[model samples]
Target chain A: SGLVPRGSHMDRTHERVLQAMAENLGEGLPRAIPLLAEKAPGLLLEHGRSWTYAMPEKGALDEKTRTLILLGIALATGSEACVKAMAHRAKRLGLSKEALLETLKIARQAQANAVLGHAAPLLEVL
Target chain B: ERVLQAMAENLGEGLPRAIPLLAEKAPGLLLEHGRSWTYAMPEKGALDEKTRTLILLGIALATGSEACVKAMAHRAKRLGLSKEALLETLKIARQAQANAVLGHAAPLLEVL
Candidate 1:
């Protein structure tokens, strides 16, 4: 929660998270933050706080490794934005194409397995 | 070689059979992925087991995969995640996942 600026609608903690994220986007996600804020300040702040926490770097995972995991999960969850964003971060962290490829395969395989389990239950109905 | 550590095989033997098929189809792939998943655990990190489980649960919920959720809920219970704690953890995903949709989509609007 380092970033602070003139009196703002967001609280200190949320402002800090927003500042950090904007910096990460490099002045690009301008409307995005406010749009969310407009949707619901409480939602924006609380969600951002949680979102920040979800970042693997913020926890036990190694920065590079976590990004890979994040990328894989994004793909599994069908979040194209997260997939691209994490891939970009992974590159910055020196993740190799081969490593990324394998990471994605892991996600694909895991997702396929999980999906198949769901399908089995439906088969009971059929 | 991949130990469940938290998997409740006793609860049911279904996972036992299905798990092997994953490795059976691709040798060593499942092992490596399992290792990678384990590597991210907060065993020795600043976050406690409960906190790690909560955050992970949030992600699991956001993924919205019933298979993954069921598996993680069992694991969280083993780590002492109570009903209250699990609900609170899930609430994080509730908020976070909603935002992820707009957060990601808003930027795309600029390019297109």
Candidate 2:
């Protein structure tokens, strides 16, 4: 509101979160984020952290491991953009190609196992 | 042996049949995969138990790994994560999944 200060604490926090998101995403800020900031600033403030690489004060996983895990999830979901974005971040963090390949192997094996696991019911009958 | 046990418990009954088959016919494969699983799915590691479970659940759901998803879902509930928390995680997964592809389209839009 006009009554409130232009540079309110809430406004600053929102901007900080948005800046975090832009950094997390990559070169340019995604269109959706700005849209969210405009239409639903509160939502942006609440859930925006999850979408970014913002970690807890004492995060359990290190940056490289977290990026690799996120890449694995991207692979599992067949998310090309996520894979590219995360892989770019991973490389920037100096993750080796070997490490990236290892994650791919795990993701591939797990996907294969999902099919076999789904077939378990059939194995019971035969 | 410990790895097998962990896999069995985490995956439920599916591995009971698969494990024996692999042990008999593909001991080497079983050992490698067992080691991989043991490392990837740790109870204690860089990521704590709760965060680990949440990440696994997101991956499982994304990959449509029903067995893994079910196991993690139960484990998360058992671990005392609230329904709202799980739902919120699911929302994050959904958004991440969408953004995974939407992000690549930026260049396409520019070209058009």
Candidate 3:
């Protein structure tokens, strides 16, 4: 569904807070905010309260596993932004160079295997 | 299944081409190669669609592949992802970008 209509449940105070947070976070404009407002307005408003309030929790995964998973996913997806962001965060979280290297290795292998898995049958048919 | 058998053969043939590419693109290849000649091979793990999309987003951002980014972002959104999560992902990405720029300046500063 499209974003919830502008003032459906959003009062002026909510809008102002959201606008301020969007500007502070450097989110270009209201586009992303409305999307969040429609999906989970409470989360968005909480995030507006504190940036970390919006951060997703990994629950059972320890810091190392979380970072490893994030890094692997980042590299596999080839997101330079994600790679750098997660890598830096991973580093700050004290992930060793060895762990980072290992995580990358895992990501590459997984991605390669997935691609090959898809292409293999096509190759035989052709 | 015939498809499964074909996959085995294809993997055998594709390994050479695939391995080299993986080696070049993934830093983890260094460790992977070592495991091949030893008994320390890593275990395989499965990833859900959400996890896969998240990784894909990172790769798209890193490679500056706007098309890939858009497609993955669309999928992510459709998969019940809130906009807050998506934007936060990008926010973290910006921090990484800034850090990389800072890292480059470190060497220059040391010389000065």
Interface Cα RMSD per model, in Å? Answer: 7.1, 5.5, 11.6
Number of clashes in every candidate structure? 0, 1, 15
The i-RMS of candidate 3 is 11.6
Model 2 CA lDDT for position A107: 65
lDDT per residue (tens digit) for residues A26-112 in model 2:
653455556555665675665444443233332444566566566778887776657776777776667788667766655665666
The Cα error of candidate 2 at residue A86, in Å, is 1.1
Q: Per-residue lDDT tens digits of candidate 2, residues B3-106?
A: 56665665554344555555556567668866666566554444445655566666777776767677668777767777755665565566566565555555
**Which pairs of residues collide in candidate 2?**
A82-B100
Better of 1 and 3 by lDDT: 1
**Candidate 3 CAPRI grade:** incorrect
| CAPRI-style docking class of model 2 based on DockQ | incorrect
True contact recovery of candidate 1: 0.12
Error of 1 at A92 (Å): 2.5
All candidates: DockQ: 0.15, 0.22, 0.07
For model 3, the stretches where C-alpha displacement exceeds 4 angstroms are: A1-126, B1-47
Q: What is the C-alpha lDDT of each candidate?
A: 0.53, 0.60, 0.47
If you score just chain A, what TM-score does every candidate get?
Answer: 0.61, 0.71, 0.54
Task: Give lDDT tens digits, candidate 1, residues B73-110.
Answer: 77676656668556655554564456457657566555
Q: Model 3, residue B18: what's the lDDT?
A: 34
* Regions of model 2 farther than 4 Å from truth: A1-10, A28-31, A34-43, A51-54, B1-58, B69-112
